[PDB]
């Protein structure tokens, strides 16, 4: 089945899932001289504030933070998007060393993580259908940089012992993604692709300019996390990651001058 290896990588993906070679894959580099300002873009509107957190798993390929989306609670608006997005999930990508380890490059500048915050189209009325739809999805993209610790990622970073292999999970309620955040909502946005199979192009990308910092010891957590499952020989979950593809014929638009 897929993964991060030499013989289950990104580049062997294509067999399984064809649309890896489509015309709206994601990640991209990101540009910044050539994304135009798109003074039409409005500001993005994160509503979190009624966000229901409610498990976190291990999926042998990253962990995901649970939300409760059966209502109205934690949503996507504004930015380039036309009507709502709940969030479902986050989830980050990470490297095995500080300088790899985001999916988006920013002039080919590789961060040491990328959080990803899931939200669907409530017009489909579930995940599943939004899946199908060319705007199906709005996925927060958001660098970390390792320097200072983020506070409000701790609460992640010390669940992490609990689910260390690949299909444990963890009650995990009361989790404010607020805390993740970093000051500004300026942002790039372009339409692409899930960027795990089976790669489905459904996402409205918003990937944030600014990044939060976290701390060498957070991301060293991250990276004791296994791909493996419980009593199977340990496989470091490092380097989850998909390398930028193609841009084909897209415009990455950018919120701010
Ligand atoms: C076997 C199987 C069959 C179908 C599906 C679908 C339809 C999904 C799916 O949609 N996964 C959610 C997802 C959310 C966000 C991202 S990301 N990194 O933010 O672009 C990537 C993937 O996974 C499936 C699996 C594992
Ligand atoms: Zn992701």
């Not at 509107?45 to 999926?59: C, P």
Request: with cysteine; hydrophobic share 35%.
């Amino acid at each position: 089945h897929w993964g991060y290896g030499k013989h289950n990588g990104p580049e062997h993906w294509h067999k399984d899932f064809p649309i890896a070679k489509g015309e709206r894959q994601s990640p991209v580099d990101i540009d910044t001289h050539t994304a135009k300002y798109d003074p039409s873009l409005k500001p993005l509107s994160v509503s979190y504030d009624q966000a229901t957190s409610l498990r976190i798993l291990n999926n042998g390929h990253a962990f995901n933070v649970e939300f409760d989306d059966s209502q109205d609670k934690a949503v996507l608006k504004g930015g380039p998007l036309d009507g709502t997005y709940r969030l479902i999930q986050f989830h980050f990508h990470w490297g095995s060393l500080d300088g790899q380890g985001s999916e988006h490059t920013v002039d080919k500048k590789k961060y040491a993580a990328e959080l990803h915050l899931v939200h669907w189209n409530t017009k489909y009325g579930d995940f599943g259908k939004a899946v199908q739809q060319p705007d199906g999805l709005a996925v927060l993209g958001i660098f970390l940089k390792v320097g200072s610790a983020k506070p409000g990622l701790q609460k992640v970073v010390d669940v992490l012992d609990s689910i260390k292999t690949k299909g444990k999970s963890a009650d995990f309620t009361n989790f404010d993604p607020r805390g993740l955040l970093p000051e500004s909502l300026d942002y790039w946005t372009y339409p692409g692709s899930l960027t795990t199979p089976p790669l489905l192009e459904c996402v409205t990308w918003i990937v944030l300019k600014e990044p939060i910092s976290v701390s060498s010891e957070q991301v060293l957590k991250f990276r004791k996390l296994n791909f493996n499952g419980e009593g199977e020989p340990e496989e470091l979950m490092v380097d989850n990651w998909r390398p930028a593809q193609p841009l084909k014929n897209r415009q990455i638009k950018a919120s701010f001058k």
